[PDB]
């Protein structure tokens, strides 16, 4: 979450100085892996 916020802030600053590809470079992979591990835990691991 902090990485996403910081990337958004840096992208906004760079755009103002003169986009979301860098912000969301690997969000899906991390989110899917974390959700899979949470599901495995919910399976009483």
């Amino acid at each position: 979450y902090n990485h996403l916020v910081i990337k958004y802030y840096q992208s906004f600053i760079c755009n103002t100085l003169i986009e979301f590809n860098y912000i969301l470079s690997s969000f899906k992979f991390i989110k899917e892996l974390n959700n899979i591990i949470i599901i495995s835990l919910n399976k009483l691991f």
Binding site: L4, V5, K7, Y8, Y9, Q10, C14, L17, Y22, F27
Partner: protein
């Protein structure tokens, strides 16, 4: 005449002493009142290590010649390398103020800011707009989240959840301005490095919003 290395080094040392104290003359109406340095972090070795770990895991899936210790160490090394790569990518794109020149009239400043090694120049910034933050501030995501549904939900869940979300800079200091202070240049906020050679009197005057007399 013959070359004298001692006098050449005396001249070089005098120049270095003048630069360290921040004392620079007026050359062409722009007085260099600030010089900074931007940290450069490695990304290619970590990306290569992460890719190698992924390919090794895939190969060990293809061929069952993988030890238990190998199957344990490879994902750990890959995850660590990927985390370090992401951290270095975030740290490299930090916009750091590298050079700052003062106008002759003492009311505008020309800023050269480094973003991932790219130098961006702003040649008109009123001194009254400058504000050095002597402490953490709050960043705002004004465009809701302005992204896909999944990312928007993720950013909304761990935040104010109501439109514009405000995040205190304390949660982001270790990756955005860990090696400097946030300076609002009217429109944009850059990171002035702690390692810097600047004209301390003029820098103190301008960074509080106070203009410098011609």
């Amino acid at each position: 005449t013959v070359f004298d290395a001692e006098l050449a080094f005396i001249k070089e040392a005098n120049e270095m002493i003048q630069q360290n104290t921040g004392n620079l003359p007026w050359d062409g109406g722009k007085k260099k009142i600030f010089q900074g340095q931007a940290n450069k972090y490695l990304e290619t070795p970590y990306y290569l290590l992460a890719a190698l770990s992924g390919l090794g895991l895939l190969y060990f899936l293809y061929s069952g010649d993988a030890k238990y210790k190998t199957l344990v160490l490879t994902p750990v090394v890959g995850i660590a390398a990927f985390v370090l790569l992401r951290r270095n990518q975030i740290l490299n794109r930090v916009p750091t103020l590298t050079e700052l020149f003062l106008h002759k009239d003492g009311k505008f400043v020309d800023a050269v800011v480094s973003v991932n090694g790219q130098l961006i120049s702003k040649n008109d910034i009123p001194v009254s707009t400058l504000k050095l933050y002597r402490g953490d501030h709050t960043v705002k995501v004004n465009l809701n989240d302005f992204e896909d549904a999944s990312a928007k939900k993720f950013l909304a869940q761990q935040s104010g959840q109501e439109g514009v979300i405000n995040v205190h800079f304390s949660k982001l200091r270790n990756l955005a301005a860990r090696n400097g202070q946030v300076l609002n240049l009217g429109d944009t906020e850059v990171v002035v490095p702690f390692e810097n050679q600047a004209n301390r009197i003029i820098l103190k005057q301008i960074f509080k919003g106070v203009e410098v007399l011609p």
